[PDB]
Amino acid sequence: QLYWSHPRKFGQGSRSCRVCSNRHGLIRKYGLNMCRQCFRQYAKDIGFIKL
Amino acid sequence: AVQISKKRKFVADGIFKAELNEFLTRELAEDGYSGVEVRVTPTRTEIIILATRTQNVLGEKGRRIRELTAVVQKRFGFPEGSVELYAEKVATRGLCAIAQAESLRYKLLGGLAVRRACYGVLRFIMESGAKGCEVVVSGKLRGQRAKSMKFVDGLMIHSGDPVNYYVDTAVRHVLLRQGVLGIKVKIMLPWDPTGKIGPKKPLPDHVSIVEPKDEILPTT
Amino acid sequence: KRKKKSYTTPKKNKHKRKKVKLAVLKYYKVDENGKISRLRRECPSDECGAGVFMASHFDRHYCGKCCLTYCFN
Amino acid sequence: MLMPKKNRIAIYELLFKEGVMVAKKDVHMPKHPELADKNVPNLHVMKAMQSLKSRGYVKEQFAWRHFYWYLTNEGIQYLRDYLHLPPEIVPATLRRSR
Amino acid sequence: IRITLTSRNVKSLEKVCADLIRGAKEKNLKVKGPVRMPTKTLRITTRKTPCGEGSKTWDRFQMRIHKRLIDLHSPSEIVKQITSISIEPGVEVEVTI
RNA sequence: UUUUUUUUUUUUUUUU
RNA sequence: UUAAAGGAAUUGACGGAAGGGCACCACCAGGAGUGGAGCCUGCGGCUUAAUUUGACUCAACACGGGAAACCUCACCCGGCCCGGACACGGACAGGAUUGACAGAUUGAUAGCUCUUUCUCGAUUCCGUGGGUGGUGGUGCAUGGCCGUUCUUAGUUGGUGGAGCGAUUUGUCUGGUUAAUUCCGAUAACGAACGAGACUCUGGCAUGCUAACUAGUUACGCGACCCCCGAGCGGUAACUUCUUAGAGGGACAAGUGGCGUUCAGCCACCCGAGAUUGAGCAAUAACAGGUCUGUGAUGCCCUUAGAUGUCCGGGGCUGCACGCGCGCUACACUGACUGGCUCAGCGUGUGCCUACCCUACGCCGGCAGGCGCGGGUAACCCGUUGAACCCCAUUCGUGAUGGGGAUCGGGGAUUGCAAUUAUUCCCCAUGAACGAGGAAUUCCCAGUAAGUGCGGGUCAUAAGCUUGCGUUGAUUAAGUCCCUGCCCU
Ligand SMILES: [Mg+2]
Ligand SMILES: [Mg+2]
Ligand SMILES: [Mg+2]
Ligand SMILES: [Mg+2]
Ligand SMILES: [Mg+2]
Ligand SMILES: [Mg+2]
Ligand SMILES: [Mg+2]
Ligand SMILES: [Mg+2]
Ligand SMILES: [Mg+2]
Ligand SMILES: [Mg+2]
Ligand SMILES: [Mg+2]
Ligand SMILES: [Mg+2]
Ligand SMILES: [Mg+2]
Ligand SMILES: [Mg+2]
Ligand SMILES: [Mg+2]
Ligand SMILES: [Mg+2]
Ligand SMILES: [Mg+2]
Ligand SMILES: [Mg+2]
Ligand SMILES: [Mg+2]
Ligand SMILES: [Mg+2]
Ligand SMILES: [Mg+2]
Ligand SMILES: [Mg+2]
Ligand SMILES: [Mg+2]
Ligand SMILES: [Mg+2]
Ligand SMILES: [Mg+2]
Ligand SMILES: [Mg+2]
Ligand SMILES: [Zn+2]
């Protein structure tokens, strides 16, 4: 069987959001993986402030 | 053989706090779940769950807290009982807005019209020491068009800095056969100078003075 | 958009495999009413051929479990 | 369409040991997630636990990518279905408290 | 032997540092001061909106990372006693020999 | 000093 | 033939109506421009097998953080897979359920199908149902979020008067302010949100705090210069520069003038600064946008020959065209070549699931390579030796050496794959373009503008965007004509 080809070790396919398995909108790299949609929901939990 | 940077370890800790808190609010929605305080010790990691019905948390034999104690271990890899969970009884039930919206949800599921339920939770919150409160319910209520409803009692602050430590935001969803209902509860905590009840910094507008000093002052 | 689909039928119903056998499959031969005769070849020892036999073919010799193939000119 | 035969008894053994099963939604085809507890990756974990959550043997929770599996006293009434095989043992969550 | 206090907020940082100095200086411990490492600022800027309509409107998030170093050259037996403090949950401690 | 026109229907109401 | 026409009266809205004000998304005085050329990139229209789709004045058009070689991907073309949970029932193979070598077949080394026949050990399989999944439809069924009305000062109830009532009075004649900001008058009385007050940052500073992950002065050793106790850089105490905590410091306080007992305004001394930049941000709405952020979701649609899912190509890039945001330019205040010379944010590896930053030496003309070393960081890159600028050379008004697209040939480098797009470099080719018509945008002091760097995307990766700096003007400090707003 061939379910899996296409190494997927890099690029847009390997990037997966930690919150809702999203890959389309870009995902940051600060030790963190979000959507930028659900990051606004969770910044108040993970401890970012605006100032 | 493992260490990461101070720049990334803080945001990893924050993602851990958010993951833990929203898993506990996604499966502890039955009783009154308020929140957590996560304490770290190089021998043991404590998780305090501020909740309303600790009877439902202990359960039959002390079962559910030990089940979720195994749960928290089996994904974050802190074995051997290094992570210890405790639950705490929230004394002021009506003061936690997350608790009050969560109490409003299970009423609004089983019948219990929006007017009666909202006035019932507002009178309870205003009786429970609150200086001011606001409950907003949006959704398909008695029609096809999205008629939003607002309910304001007392004294509310919207702008400026001390919103972020005076106003406790509670935003929840309710699934019904009509669709979804979004609820927003925000409660201005009273200023109590000492204790766990409200915040300890006064309002910068509300300025207190002392009453007059004395009287007698004549020469000898 | 509002696209509409149909079968063009340039690729007919090719069936999934309906496994064909005999009613039972009789393998072993008894000689002299008590001596065992085995008609078919045995797989070599790669932890398969102890109780697993080979397949007959035009030129090949196939092992069922571990896919060992022997073939000779 | 089955697992190996050791797979079913091993994953029910893990459930009967801990009382807690945990996996993630990543369904084995673009990438190969393995459970750190076992050998078999994740697809067979899903197919084994969906039979429990369908019949009502094990309750389900979902979080951010992951499945957590929860056990009720009705869940213990069908832990009796696992207790078909061994002698009478409770998984080490319900039993004792110090 | 040095101790690195890396904390989440400035007030709990100052309070645990003051407690450490007050629990240090009654002994005969020569203490190097609470040296201030400079503040790291991890910034994330966000489009604020799930779909691109309206005015271009950006978040501006910050965290402040604070860090104090204190040097306590001693036998490590005293440092084991120094470690035992009911410490605030927003403070991280490193010890280095 | 100018400077005119711009489909057609889409819009219902509570108990304490 | 029609279910209203109409009368007073209230609140909006609007007025090329009047009074009073405000704003560079408005103007004046100016600057840089854009619109003209080439190119990068979105959009419409063509073409297409498909050129996936949303948004269309501000309030869409470098926007979906949309920079696509495939994955992404939602669209075509072709080929696999069940992840058919779970009940009841059918065969139940007298146990035979799937997995596969070889050959044909197919891009395939797909047991997909056919030839062939070993394995597989009660999960199947067939069906009746139910169910699962969906970047399918519907943002005019919805939640959450965001934007806008609306960067202006507005908004609301309790009691009381006015009126049958809709409502009003508070919320105002006047003075003042960026402001419903205050003083005052007063059928209103006390009140609340908003503005401020608040949080961050900027500037000053103590000779408080105190520093081998930052320095400085001294004191040495040490190299050279002259040699004359000197001078330039290598290896005992104090914090001024470096970092960051507590605190202080600026309030129209002092003077004078204009001011109604005022509210406050103007000018000036002293100061570091006579106020800087943001954040947050009301009541009520749009039938604004997102079902393509979600395991947030209703209903519909599809569910085994699938609209699920992989897998292989192709594509969103395809060009007679019109439009938007931009980059490079149109040269002498300049290009070329050498020399000299100073930054600041902040980023960097075995990461909750897949990931570096570079020092040194040697090879190569360059892009690059090879060994070696450091950095999980005030420790190393890195006293970030940046560009602009400055000094010197050449060019001399010429489509010139300005201009660098077009494109021939080659060489590195990422990658699984660059061809109908990577990217970088060398040689060659050397177009339009002569400061831009109608019109329009943006802008008041470290400001516009020139210039480079860091981050986001990433492997390769900026002309985009977002922060940082660096050099640093002109003209206002005013009005309501034009655009538009607030109060009678
Ligand atoms: Mg709404
Ligand atoms: Mg006409
Ligand atoms: Mg009239
Ligand atoms: Mg002008
Ligand atoms: Mg230009
Ligand atoms: Mg042009
Ligand atoms: Mg198109
Ligand atoms: Mg809408
Ligand atoms: Mg729509
Ligand atoms: Mg909506
Ligand atoms: Mg609409
Ligand atoms: Mg009356
Ligand atoms: Mg009125
Ligand atoms: Mg100092
Ligand atoms: Mg507003
Ligand atoms: Mg979904
Ligand atoms: Mg496109
Ligand atoms: Mg054009
Ligand atoms: Mg624009
Ligand atoms: Mg040139
Ligand atoms: Mg020329
Ligand atoms: Mg224009
Ligand atoms: Mg230039
Ligand atoms: Mg970049
Ligand atoms: Mg980058
Ligand atoms: Mg971009
Ligand atoms: Zn997510």
Side-chain angles (χ1 to χ4, degrees), chain A:
Chain A
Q1 286 293 322
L2 188 63
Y3 293 161
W4 183 60
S5 297
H6 184 277
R8 202 186 294 270
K9 297 183 287 186
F10 60 96
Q12 191 68 40
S14 65
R15 308 293 300 276
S16 177
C17 174
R18 195 177 294 172
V19 175
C20 64
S21 180
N22 193 0
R23 65 181 68 248
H24 180 72
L26 72 84
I27 301 169
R28 293 177 296 273
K29 290 178 178 175
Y30 281 154
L32 169 141
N33 287 321
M34 302 299 288
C35 288
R36 81 162 168 84
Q37 285 81 242
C38 60
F39 179 72
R40 299 184 71 246
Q41 304 292 320
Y42 295 156
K44 63 183 181 180
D45 286 330
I46 68 175
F48 284 98
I49 57 174
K50 287 186 179 180
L51 297 178

Coordinates of all heavy atoms in Angstrom, one line a residue, chain A:
Chain A
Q1 N 0.8 -1.2 0.0 CA 0.0 0.0 0.0 C 0.8 1.3 0.0 O 1.9 1.3 0.5 CB -0.9 0.0 1.2 CG -2.1 -0.9 1.1 CD -3.1 -0.5 0.0 OE1 -3.3 0.7 -0.2 NE2 -3.6 -1.5 -0.7
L2 N 0.3 2.3 -0.6 CA 0.9 3.6 -0.7 C -0.1 4.6 -0.2 O -0.8 5.3 -1.0 CB 1.5 3.9 -2.0 CG 2.3 5.2 -2.2 CD1 3.6 5.1 -1.4 CD2 2.7 5.4 -3.7
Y3 N -0.3 4.8 1.1 CA -1.0 5.9 1.6 C -0.2 7.2 1.6 O -0.6 8.3 1.3 CB -1.5 5.7 3.1 CG -2.6 4.6 3.2 CD1 -2.8 4.0 4.4 CD2 -3.3 4.1 2.1 CE1 -3.7 3.0 4.6 CE2 -4.3 3.1 2.3 CZ -4.4 2.5 3.5 OH -5.4 1.5 3.7
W4 N 1.1 7.0 2.0 CA 2.0 8.1 2.3 C 3.1 8.1 1.3 O 3.9 7.1 1.2 CB 2.5 8.1 3.7 CG 3.4 9.2 4.0 CD1 3.0 10.5 4.0 CD2 4.8 9.2 4.4 NE1 4.1 11.3 4.3 CE2 5.2 10.5 4.6 CE3 5.7 8.2 4.6 CZ2 6.5 10.9 5.0 CZ3 7.0 8.5 5.0 CH2 7.4 9.8 5.2
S5 N 3.2 9.2 0.5 CA 4.4 9.5 -0.3 C 4.9 10.9 0.2 O 4.5 11.3 1.3 CB 4.1 9.6 -1.8 OG 3.6 8.3 -2.2
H6 N 5.7 11.5 -0.6 CA 5.9 13.0 -0.6 C 6.4 13.5 0.8 O 5.5 14.0 1.6 CB 4.5 13.6 -0.9 CG 4.6 15.1 -1.0 ND1 4.5 15.9 0.1 CD2 4.7 15.9 -2.1 CE1 4.6 17.2 -0.3 NE2 4.7 17.2 -1.6
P7 N 7.7 13.4 1.0 CA 8.3 13.3 2.4 C 7.7 14.2 3.5 O 7.7 13.8 4.7 CB 9.7 13.7 2.2 CG 10.0 13.3 0.8 CD 8.7 13.6 0.0
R8 N 7.2 15.4 3.1 CA 6.4 16.3 4.0 C 7.2 16.8 5.2 O 6.7 17.0 6.3 CB 5.1 15.7 4.4 CG 4.0 16.6 4.8 CD 2.8 15.8 5.3 NE 2.2 15.0 4.2 CZ 1.2 15.4 3.4 NH1 0.7 16.7 3.6 NH2 0.7 14.7 2.5
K9 N 8.6 16.8 5.0 CA 9.4 17.1 6.2 C 9.6 18.6 6.3 O 10.3 19.0 7.3 CB 10.8 16.4 6.0 CG 10.7 14.9 5.9 CD 12.1 14.3 5.8 CE 12.6 14.4 4.4 NZ 13.9 13.7 4.2
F10 N 9.1 19.4 5.4 CA 9.3 20.8 5.3 C 8.2 21.4 4.5 O 7.4 20.6 3.9 CB 10.7 21.1 4.7 CG 10.9 20.5 3.3 CD1 10.6 21.3 2.2 CD2 11.3 19.2 3.1 CE1 10.8 20.8 0.9 CE2 11.5 18.7 1.9 CZ 11.2 19.5 0.8
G11 N 8.1 22.7 4.4 CA 7.1 23.4 3.6 C 5.8 23.5 4.3 O 5.7 23.4 5.5
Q12 N 4.8 23.8 3.5 CA 3.5 24.2 4.0 C 2.8 23.0 4.6 O 1.9 23.2 5.5 CB 2.7 24.9 3.0 CG 1.4 25.6 3.4 CD 1.8 26.8 4.3 OE1 2.7 27.6 4.0 NE2 1.0 27.0 5.3
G13 N 3.0 21.8 4.1 CA 2.3 20.7 4.6 C 2.7 20.2 6.0 O 1.9 19.8 6.7
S14 N 4.0 20.4 6.3 CA 4.5 20.0 7.6 C 4.0 20.9 8.7 O 4.0 20.5 9.9 CB 6.0 19.9 7.6 OG 6.6 21.2 7.4
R15 N 3.7 22.1 8.4 CA 3.2 23.1 9.3 C 1.8 22.8 9.7 O 0.9 22.8 8.8 CB 3.3 24.5 8.8 CG 4.7 24.8 8.2 CD 5.8 24.9 9.3 NE 5.5 25.9 10.3 CZ 5.8 27.2 10.2 NH1 6.4 27.6 9.1 NH2 5.5 28.0 11.2
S16 N 1.5 22.6 11.0 CA 0.2 22.3 11.5 C 0.0 23.0 12.8 O 0.8 23.1 13.6 CB 0.0 20.7 11.7 OG -1.2 20.4 12.2
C17 N -1.2 23.6 12.9 CA -1.6 24.4 14.0 C -1.8 23.5 15.2 O -2.3 22.4 15.1 CB -2.8 25.3 13.8 SG -3.3 26.1 15.2
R18 N -1.5 24.1 16.4 CA -1.6 23.3 17.6 C -3.0 23.3 18.2 O -3.4 22.6 19.1 CB -0.6 23.8 18.6 CG -0.3 22.9 19.9 CD 0.8 23.5 20.7 NE 2.0 23.5 20.1 CZ 3.1 24.1 20.5 NH1 3.1 24.7 21.7 NH2 4.3 24.1 19.9
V19 N -3.9 24.1 17.5 CA -5.2 24.4 18.2 C -6.3 23.7 17.4 O -7.2 23.1 18.0 CB -5.4 25.9 18.3 CG1 -6.8 26.2 18.8 CG2 -4.4 26.5 19.2
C20 N -6.3 23.8 16.1 CA -7.4 23.3 15.3 C -7.0 22.6 14.0 O -7.8 22.4 13.1 CB -8.4 24.4 15.0 SG -7.7 25.7 13.9
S21 N -5.7 22.1 14.0 CA -5.1 21.3 12.9 C -5.2 22.1 11.6 O -5.4 21.6 10.5 CB -5.8 20.0 12.7 OG -5.2 19.2 11.6
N22 N -5.1 23.5 11.7 CA -5.1 24.3 10.5 C -3.7 24.4 9.9 O -2.7 24.3 10.7 CB -5.6 25.7 10.9 CG -5.9 26.6 9.7 OD1 -5.8 26.2 8.6 ND2 -6.4 27.8 10.0
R23 N -3.6 24.6 8.6 CA -2.3 24.7 8.0 C -2.2 25.8 7.0 O -1.1 26.2 6.5 CB -2.0 23.4 7.3 CG -2.9 23.0 6.1 CD -2.6 21.7 5.5 NE -2.8 20.6 6.4 CZ -1.9 19.8 6.9 NH1 -0.6 20.0 6.6 NH2 -2.2 18.8 7.7
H24 N -3.4 26.4 6.7 CA -3.4 27.4 5.5 C -2.9 28.8 5.9 O -1.9 29.2 5.3 CB -4.9 27.5 5.0 CG -5.0 28.4 3.9 ND1 -4.5 28.1 2.6 CD2 -5.6 29.6 3.8 CE1 -4.8 29.1 1.8 NE2 -5.4 30.0 2.5
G25 N -3.6 29.4 6.9 CA -3.0 30.7 7.4 C -1.7 30.4 8.1 O -1.5 29.3 8.7
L26 N -0.8 31.3 8.0 CA 0.6 31.0 8.4 C 0.7 30.9 9.9 O 0.0 31.5 10.7 CB 1.6 32.1 7.9 CG 1.8 33.5 8.3 CD1 2.8 33.6 9.6 CD2 2.4 34.4 7.2
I27 N 1.7 30.1 10.3 CA 1.9 29.7 11.7 C 3.3 30.2 12.1 O 4.2 30.1 11.3 CB 1.8 28.2 11.8 CG1 0.4 27.7 11.3 CG2 2.0 27.7 13.2 CD1 0.3 26.2 11.1
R28 N 3.4 30.8 13.2 CA 4.6 31.4 13.6 C 5.6 30.4 14.2 O 5.3 29.2 14.4 CB 4.3 32.5 14.6 CG 3.5 33.7 14.0 CD 3.1 34.7 15.0 NE 2.2 34.1 16.0 CZ 0.9 34.0 15.8 NH1 0.3 34.5 14.7 NH2 0.2 33.4 16.7
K29 N 6.8 30.9 14.5 CA 7.8 30.1 15.1 C 8.5 30.9 16.2 O 9.6 31.5 15.9 CB 8.8 29.6 14.1 CG 8.3 28.6 13.0 CD 9.5 28.3 12.1 CE 9.1 27.2 11.0 NZ 10.2 27.0 10.0
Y30 N 8.0 30.8 17.4 CA 8.7 31.3 18.6 C 8.7 30.3 19.7 O 8.6 30.6 20.9 CB 8.0 32.6 19.1 CG 8.3 33.9 18.4 CD1 7.5 35.0 18.4 CD2 9.5 34.0 17.7 CE1 7.8 36.1 17.8 CE2 9.8 35.2 17.1 CZ 9.0 36.2 17.1 OH 9.3 37.4 16.4
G31 N 8.7 29.0 19.4 CA 8.3 28.0 20.2 C 6.8 27.8 20.3 O 6.4 27.0 21.2
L32 N 6.1 28.4 19.4 CA 4.7 28.5 19.5 C 4.1 28.2 18.1 O 4.7 28.5 17.1 CB 4.3 30.0 19.9 CG 2.8 30.5 19.8 CD1 2.5 31.3 21.0 CD2 2.8 31.4 18.6
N33 N 2.9 27.6 18.1 CA 2.2 27.3 16.8 C 0.7 27.6 17.0 O 0.0 27.0 17.8 CB 2.4 25.9 16.4 CG 3.8 25.6 15.9 OD1 4.4 26.4 15.1 ND2 4.3 24.4 16.2
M34 N 0.2 28.6 16.2 CA -1.2 29.0 16.3 C -1.7 29.3 14.9 O -1.2 28.7 14.0 CB -1.3 30.3 17.1 CG -0.7 30.3 18.6 SD -1.5 29.1 19.7 CE -3.1 29.9 19.9
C35 N -2.8 30.0 14.9 CA -3.4 30.4 13.6 C -3.2 31.8 13.2 O -2.9 32.0 12.0 CB -5.0 30.1 13.6 SG -5.5 28.4 13.7
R36 N -3.1 32.7 14.2 CA -3.3 34.2 14.3 C -4.8 34.4 14.4 O -5.2 35.6 14.7 CB -2.8 35.1 13.1 CG -3.7 35.1 11.9 CD -3.4 36.3 11.0 NE -4.1 36.1 9.7 CZ -5.3 36.4 9.4 NH1 -6.1 36.9 10.4 NH2 -5.8 36.2 8.2
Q37 N -5.7 33.4 14.1 CA -7.1 33.6 14.5 C -7.4 33.2 15.9 O -8.1 34.0 16.6 CB -8.0 32.8 13.6 CG -8.2 33.2 12.2 CD -7.0 32.9 11.2 OE1 -6.4 33.8 10.7 NE2 -6.8 31.6 11.1
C38 N -6.8 32.1 16.4 CA -7.1 31.7 17.7 C -6.0 32.2 18.7 O -6.1 31.9 19.9 CB -7.2 30.2 17.8 SG -5.7 29.4 17.2
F39 N -5.0 32.8 18.2 CA -4.0 33.4 19.0 C -4.6 34.6 19.8 O -4.2 34.8 21.0 CB -2.8 33.9 18.2 CG -1.8 34.6 19.1 CD1 -1.0 33.8 19.9 CD2 -1.6 36.0 19.0 CE1 0.0 34.4 20.7 CE2 -0.6 36.6 19.8 CZ 0.2 35.8 20.6
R40 N -5.5 35.3 19.3 CA -6.2 36.4 20.0 C -7.1 35.9 21.1 O -7.3 36.6 22.1 CB -7.0 37.3 19.0 CG -6.2 37.9 17.9 CD -7.1 38.8 17.1 NE -7.5 40.0 17.9 CZ -8.7 40.2 18.2 NH1 -9.7 39.4 18.0 NH2 -9.0 41.3 18.9
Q41 N -7.6 34.7 21.0 CA -8.4 34.1 22.0 C -7.5 33.7 23.2 O -7.9 33.8 24.4 CB -9.1 32.8 21.5 CG -9.9 33.1 20.3 CD -11.2 33.9 20.5 OE1 -11.8 33.7 21.6 NE2 -11.5 34.8 19.6
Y42 N -6.2 33.4 23.0 CA -5.4 32.7 23.9 C -4.3 33.5 24.4 O -3.5 33.0 25.3 CB -4.9 31.4 23.4 CG -6.0 30.3 23.0 CD1 -5.8 29.4 22.1 CD2 -7.3 30.4 23.6 CE1 -6.8 28.5 21.8 CE2 -8.2 29.5 23.3 CZ -8.0 28.5 22.4 OH -9.0 27.7 22.1
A43 N -4.1 34.7 23.9 CA -3.0 35.6 24.4 C -3.2 36.0 25.9 O -2.3 36.2 26.6 CB -2.9 36.8 23.5
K44 N -4.5 36.2 26.2 CA -4.9 36.5 27.6 C -4.6 35.3 28.6 O -4.4 35.6 29.8 CB -6.3 36.9 27.7 CG -7.3 35.8 27.3 CD -8.7 36.2 27.3 CE -9.7 35.1 27.0 NZ -11.1 35.5 26.9
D45 N -4.5 34.1 28.1 CA -4.1 33.0 28.9 C -2.6 32.9 29.0 O -2.0 32.8 30.0 CB -4.8 31.7 28.4 CG -6.2 31.6 28.7 OD1 -6.7 32.2 29.7 OD2 -7.0 30.9 27.9
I46 N -2.0 32.8 27.8 CA -0.5 32.6 27.7 C 0.3 33.8 28.1 O 1.5 33.6 28.2 CB -0.1 32.1 26.3 CG1 -0.2 33.2 25.3 CG2 -1.0 30.9 25.9 CD1 0.3 32.9 24.0
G47 N -0.3 34.9 28.4 CA 0.4 36.0 29.1 C 1.0 37.1 28.3 O 1.9 37.7 28.8
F48 N 0.4 37.4 27.2 CA 0.8 38.6 26.4 C -0.1 39.8 26.8 O -1.3 39.6 27.1 CB 0.7 38.4 24.9 CG 1.9 37.6 24.4 CD1 1.8 36.2 24.2 CD2 3.1 38.2 24.1 CE1 2.8 35.5 23.7 CE2 4.2 37.4 23.6 CZ 4.0 36.1 23.4
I49 N 0.4 41.0 26.8 CA -0.3 42.2 27.1 C -0.1 43.2 25.9 O 0.9 43.1 25.2 CB 0.1 42.8 28.4 CG1 1.6 43.1 28.5 CG2 -0.4 41.9 29.6 CD1 2.0 43.8 29.7
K50 N -1.0 44.1 25.7 CA -0.9 45.0 24.6 C 0.1 46.2 24.9 O 1.1 46.3 24.2 CB -2.2 45.6 24.2 CG -3.1 44.6 23.5 CD -4.4 45.3 23.0 CE -5.3 44.3 22.3 NZ -6.6 45.0 21.8
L51 N -0.2 47.0 26.0 CA 0.5 48.2 26.3 C 0.5 49.2 25.1 O 1.5 49.2 24.3 CB 1.9 48.0 26.8 CG 2.0 47.2 28.1 CD1 3.5 47.0 28.5 CD2 1.3 47.9 29.2

